[PDB]
Design a binder for these strands. Structure first.
Ligand SMILES: [Mg+2]
Ligand SMILES: [Mg+2]
Ligand SMILES: [Mg+2]
Ligand SMILES: [Mg+2]
Ligand SMILES: [Mg+2]
Ligand SMILES: [Mg+2]
Ligand SMILES: [Mg+2]
Ligand SMILES: [Mg+2]
Ligand SMILES: [Mg+2]
Ligand SMILES: [Mg+2]
Ligand SMILES: [Mg+2]
Ligand SMILES: [Mg+2]
Ligand SMILES: [Mg+2]
Ligand SMILES: [Mg+2]
Lengths: 88, 119, 101, 73
RNA sequence: GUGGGAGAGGGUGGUGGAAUUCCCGGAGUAGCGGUGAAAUGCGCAGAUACCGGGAGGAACGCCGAUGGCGAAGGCAGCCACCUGGUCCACCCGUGACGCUGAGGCGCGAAAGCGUGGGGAGCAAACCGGAUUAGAUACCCGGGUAGUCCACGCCCUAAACGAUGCGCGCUAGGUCUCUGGGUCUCCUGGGGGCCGAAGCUAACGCGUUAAGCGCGCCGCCUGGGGAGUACGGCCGCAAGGC
């Protein structure tokens, strides 16, 4: 699983400021975490579809936030991406 | 020929027949009767009367071995399970106890159609 | 790592010699798999509701270690290899849920 | 039927998760190794459900029976 | 976000006891079985019934329901690991980031197909017994594919609540599952029943709408011919759209 601690180090490394948790980056951050975990898992448990839908959704919500991002501040966006590993 | 004195009586009832087995305390059968044995063939083989007769036969035959007391053990719901348990009590043979040991799986093999339809 | 209550039921006909040997192996194992023994209890011989391995009884060992999840199965895997060892139930810990209180 | 005494009333406070407490678990088992219903165990949905999981562990360990023979018939 | 809760939600590994079949030994003898009756069939190469030992396959009794989880198909022995959804409280963060969704992609009971494995019980076909005017059936005795595992495929269904998804509004009573509270009951999420207003051809529905409204998708347009023909796309095929 993802440890409370593990999770926190994420929020820190992304929050727009002290006490920031739900900013459109932190979230895109948190999701990337869950995605890379799930993605991993399913790499091994190929027949575990019920889990895969959870992913198909996670990847969805992310793609949706990033969209919003690239529309209200193409910088934070263009900044978040390069900061993460989305794109190529 | 062995003088077993105290034994164990198995009553295997069923809708089609009632076979009775008398064994020693270890479980090795001494004697045995049944619908067939007693003379009834086919259908009446399993009536409760047949049961009665069969039950009694098992006792008598087992009496020679010197049998006097015995623990009855039942299996099956067949028509006739009771009479057997009755006769076996009124055969002199001291019926120490009675038990239901009818086996039942914890859901194992697909029963024959006649026994499914349970869904 | 997490708290797992370990259970073991081994042959009741053991001489002190043969016995200590097995317990020794239980440690050899538990230790080999990052298992810190928070505690233990040894009820010993108990009348089983049904015979196990033809034997009408069994000697019980109850622990409570704290170890890496990624192990446990291996732990029990190994912990079972022994012959005198008849059962191993590595249930995970859980704070009690009282009732009629 | 069921109107006996409620296998819970006649008992004190106890950890429903204790899978070694044969001396209490046993009480929840029928005349046979069958788990008693709520109308007899007097427990609640949640309670009864945790019991079950317990009595089942007890059975694997060997402290509780999976089945017993009926006496008298 | 933080703190909490329930669950047969999914995947992997391990494992428990009951029963069935088979083999081994013991003890034991003439039948067992099966039916409305019977018979085929099994049994003196010793069956059935009984005790002990083993092998193996598949399924999980009680708990258990008016129950729960899931988007659907569907999911219940137990343990660990891996993993999805969801609910309540706190009102802490972002600041309309929303809803629906043609195409697309994925999932999708059973049967069925391909390769390999497995095969205890069950059982299309089939081989027999019986019933019958006949009996290519219902009942009985056998039995192969299959039912099981893996990998790949098929993509159907009374795939049903025969009720597309989301949101707002419109009496209550009662039962229940799970959370929070000042825990006689209030408040939230889910499952039932009776019912206001209202709706409806009627039956019924009725805060879990089939009510009152708004958004978006899909679909219908008398019956037979016909889910057929042709064409196209998909499939190894069966065959699907
Ligand atoms: Mg605020
Ligand atoms: Mg602001
Ligand atoms: Mg399918
Ligand atoms: Mg299939
Ligand atoms: Mg095949
Ligand atoms: Mg058959
Ligand atoms: Mg047949
Ligand atoms: Mg409600
Ligand atoms: Mg409610
Ligand atoms: Mg009215
Ligand atoms: Mg109604
Ligand atoms: Mg027409
Ligand atoms: Mg068709
Ligand atoms: Mg083609």
């Amino acid at each position: 699983p993802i440890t409370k601690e593990e999770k926190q180090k994420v929020i820190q490394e992304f929050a727009r400021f002290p006490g920031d948790t739900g900013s459109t980056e932190v979230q895109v951050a948190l999701l990337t975490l869950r995605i890379n975990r799930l993605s991993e898992h399913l790499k091994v448990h190929k027949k575990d579809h019920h889990s895969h839908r959870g992913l198909l959704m996670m990847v969805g919500q992310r793609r949706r936030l990033l969209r919003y991002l690239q529309r209200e501040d193409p910088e934070r966006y263009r900044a978040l991406i390069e900061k993460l590993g989305i794109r190529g | 020929k062995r003088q077993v004195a105290s034994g164990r009586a198995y009553i295997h009832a069923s809708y089609n027949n009632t076979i009775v087995t008398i064994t020693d305390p270890d479980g090795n059968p001494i004697t045995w009767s049944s619908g067939g044995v007693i003379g009834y063939k086919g259908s009446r083989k399993g009536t409760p009367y047949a049961a009665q007769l069969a039950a009694l036969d098992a006792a008598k035959k087992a009496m020679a071995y010197g049998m006097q007391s015995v623990d009855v053990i039942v299996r099956g719901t067949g028509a006739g399970r009771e009479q057997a348990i009755r006769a076996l009590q009124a055969s002199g043979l001291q019926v120490k106890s009675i038990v239901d040991d009818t086996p039942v799986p914890h859901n194992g093999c697909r029963p024959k159609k006649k026994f499914r339809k349970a869904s | 790592m997490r708290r797992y209550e370990v259970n073991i039921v081994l042959n009741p006909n053991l001489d002190q010699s043969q016995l200590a040997l097995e317990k020794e192996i239980i440690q050899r194992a538990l230790e080999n798999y990052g298992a810190r023994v928070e505690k233990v209890e040894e009820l010993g011989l108990r009348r089983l509701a049904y015979p196990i391995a033809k034997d009408p009884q069994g000697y019980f060992l109850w622990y409570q270690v704290e170890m890496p999840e990624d192990r446990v199965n291996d732990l029990a895997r190994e912990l079972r290899i022994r012959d005198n060892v008849r059962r191993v139930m590595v249930v995970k810990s859980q704070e009690p849920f009282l009732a009629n209180a | 039927p069921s109107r006996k005494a409620k296998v819970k009333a006649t008992l004190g406070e106890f950890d429903l998760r204790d899978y070694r407490n044969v001396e209490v678990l046993k009480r929840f088992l029928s005349e046979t190794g069958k788990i008693l219903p709520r109308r007899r165990t007097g427990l609640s949905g949640k309670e009864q459900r945790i019991l079950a999981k317990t009595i089942k562990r007890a059975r694997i360990l060997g402290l509780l029976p999976f089945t017993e023979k009926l006496v008298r018939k």
